[model samples]
Target: FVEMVDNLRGKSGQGYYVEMTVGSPPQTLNILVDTGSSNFAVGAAPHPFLHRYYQRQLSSTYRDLRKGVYVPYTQGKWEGELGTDLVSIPHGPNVTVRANIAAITESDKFFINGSNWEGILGLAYAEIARPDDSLEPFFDSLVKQTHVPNLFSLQLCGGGSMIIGGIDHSLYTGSLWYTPIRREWYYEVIIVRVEINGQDLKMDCKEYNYDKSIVDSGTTNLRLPKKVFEAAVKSIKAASSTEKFPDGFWLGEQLVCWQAGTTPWNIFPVISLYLMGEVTNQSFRITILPQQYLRPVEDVATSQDDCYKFAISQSSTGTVMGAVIMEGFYVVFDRARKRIGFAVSACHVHDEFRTAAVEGPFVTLEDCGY
Candidate 1:
């Protein structure tokens, strides 16, 4: 049976998270869902940032593995004790699986003030698991115990849903377009090229996949390589009618305000990413409108003006298709088939407007095979 969980949270200061119960008496906690790494770590000690934490002493089923674990992130790091515990999803499968848990005792910048999640559940392969690759990931353990298919799908529009072992067809529209997974480490894929308003960037195809390209839900922005980012920004400026955008806007340092009831989307061009298709020498494109890239800022004190910021940034490591792009589609992590799928999401609507679209199967001779 496929386990399904609804009420997946997104668009918060952090990435997506869902509610899950841990331990005997069932202490419910919100856990961040991340696909970029493999480590089920939770706050075990009381800290200034967290509202609550896991009480290991209270759980009778908890067993210490007698190993210390540490993991570093792009922003912060955490250290904890390795342990095993019976964990279950309240809204998912009824069965419980004994899974590896990192009981975090100390952290820096990993947990922030006013964040709603107390733990992070990594959903990627066990290759990047902390301590060692021998440690099984939570999803891997769940699949082994339940005998469910080794696949999951995610919908990240607002409070979306995450389905384990199967796909929920109702949450997406049109047929799913698939791209072969390049590597198991980070759900890596091959990016053929980038387009702005149906016009290609015309750069070397390798630039798009310089070091690697991945579809990560844990990251906040759409990160591009240095050369690709510069080219993209240059194209955006040339295509738009507004020529005098603030320098801070392009650097992602500050948000710019427009008069209330006015929008800057008309001036911006649609951004599209062409990914290598499952079939050889074929590719598919997923395009995101400005409404999805120029994120609106809420709760900020402003007088009769609405503020927005660019959600694309420069990355030296690799091109990352983060939440800025994932919010537009339903993403499938099909490990069994060694591919990823994308379909237009039902929740890709904002203020009565659809913010994303998908097109594909364009024939190409470029070779990006690994």
Candidate 2:
């Protein structure tokens, strides 16, 4: 049976969150759906930024494991106690599994003020799980208990939905392009090349896969390796009409504003990435329009112009295919098959801005073996 986990909302278009229930009495809380790490952690104690938290004492099924869990992110960190509890998804498969959970007691900048999510549900493989991989991940436990297929797909446009046990064919259109999972950790995939408008970066294909590239749902921007980032920036500037940009615009520290209701889409070029396909010498390309990368600043009150911030950043860690790219297509985490799938998302049909483009299966003898 397919688990239709819906009501997945994006927090200011930065992070996507979904509702989940935990404990015996079932305290429902909003959880950040992250595929970058493994650890289903929730705010157990009262947090100044959270509206509510899980009261472990109130649940009869709660069991403290006496082990501590410490998770660190690019922006924040949290300290918690590891425990076991009855966990279930309200909109998913109608089954409850005894799962490992981190009861967050103290945190720093992890729970931002005015954010809607109180917890984080990491969906990546168990290798990155806090403490160690000996502790099973929540999805692994759920699949073992219910005997569901070891696959899940995500569609992150509008109030998106996540299919837990199998693929939801209706959420996407045309064919589902599959790419081999280069590594099991963090849904890693080899990106063959980068394109701006119709021109290629013309660099060594391995540079695109430098360090490592992964489809990470937890990350906010489309982070590129330093070399790729520089190349992309130069190409974008050369292709666009705007010769001058505001200071700190490319650094992601400042926003660029134009006349209110006047979009800057025409000034920017479409960005694309070619991923190594499952079949040898074949690749597929996914493209995101300017609207997907130049995200508007919603909270900034500007009477004259609507401000937008660049959604692509340079990363020292590695290249990250974050929410900025994920929002464009329906992404599938087919763990059992050791591959990832991408298709044109159905949710983009009604969008004011044409957000995404998916194409290829192009035959190319590009050396991507790294």
The candidate that wins on lDDT is: 1
**Estimated TM-score per prediction?**
0.95, 0.95
lDDT of 2 by residue, 1-370 (tens): 3447455877435588888998989999999889988889899999889999999998999999989987777688899999999998888777889999999999998886766889988898988888898878898998899987899888988378888878887788888899998887788898887899879999888888778889988887899989999999988888775658964998889988878888757768888899998878888999888777887777655757888889999998778998878875899999999999999998753246555767887877556645
Clashing pairs in 1: none
User: Can you tell me which runs of candidate 1 are displaced by over 4 Å?
Assistant: 1-5, 350-355
In model 2, which regions exceed 4 Å deviation?
Answer: 1-5, 349-355, 366-370
Model 1 global lDDT (CA atoms, 0 to 1):
0.85
Tell me how many clashing residue pairs each candidate has.
0, 0
Candidate 1's displacement at residue 301, Å, is 1.3
**lDDT (Cα atoms) of all candidates against the true structure:** 0.85, 0.84
| CA-only RMSD, every prediction | 1.9, 2.0
Expressed as tens digits, the lDDT of each residue in 125-152 for candidate 1 is 8888998899999999998899778898
